[PDB]
Amino acid sequence: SGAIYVGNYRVVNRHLATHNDWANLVWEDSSRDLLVSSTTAQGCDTIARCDCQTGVYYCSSRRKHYPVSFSKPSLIFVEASEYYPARYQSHLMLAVGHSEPGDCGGILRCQHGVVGIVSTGGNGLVGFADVRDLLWLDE
Numbered sequence: 001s002g003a004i005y006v007g008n009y010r011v012v013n014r015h016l017a018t019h020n021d022w023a024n025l026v027w028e029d030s031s032r033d034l035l036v037s038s039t040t041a042q043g044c045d046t047i048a049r050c051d052c053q054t055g056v057y058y059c060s061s062r063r064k065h066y067p068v069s070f071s072k073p074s075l076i077f078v079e080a081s082e083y084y085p086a087r088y089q090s091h092l093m094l095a096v097g098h099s100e101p102g103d104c105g106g107i108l109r110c111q112h113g114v115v116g117i118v119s120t121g122g123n124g125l126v127g128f129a130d131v132r133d134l135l136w137l138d139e
């Protein structure tokens with residue numbers, strides 16, 4: 001579990017979005033596993049605007065932060081689940097690191113700010129849904 005709070009927006013994994021998230025929907029993309037809802041309170045997270053391939057992510061299954069090298073956002077195959085059929089997930093970045101079900105929503109940050117959130121993993125890998133291209137989150 002976990003979300004990014006920037007301005008009047010809340011960014012969450014689309015498969016974990018609540019009734020309130022869907023009732024206050026701004027944008028969602030099943031292919032990216034992202035959903036953005038509106039909030040009344042102001043969010044103070046800062047979004048990174050860069051091409052960093054190194055950063056630190058929060059791993060709830062270890063209650064720890066880990067430094068990682070991660071790939072550029074790309075289309076990657078993702079197996080079926082109670083949330084999606086087998087498909088390519090776009091804007092996804094992989095890293096070698098620990099992650100297990102329950103870790104989705106963990107933030108990945110670089111020195112510039114928030115890069116993305118945990119969305120996939122297993123087998124000694126962790127996948128992050130990138131948010132750096134969503135320039136509208138700032139305005």
Ligand SMILES: C[C@@H](C(=O)N1CCC[C@H](C(N)=O)C1)c1noc2ccccc12
Pocket residue numbers: 015033078081083084089099100101102103104118119120121122123
């Ligand atoms: C269950 C599998 C997974 O990635 N899912 C389920 C949840 C939805 C994911 C998706 N993006 O479509 C696919 C998984 N394996 O290891 C992990 C580690 C972190 C996080 C999710 C996992």
Ligand SMILES: [Zn+2]
Pocket residue numbers: 048049050051052110111112113
């Ligand atoms: Zn950066």
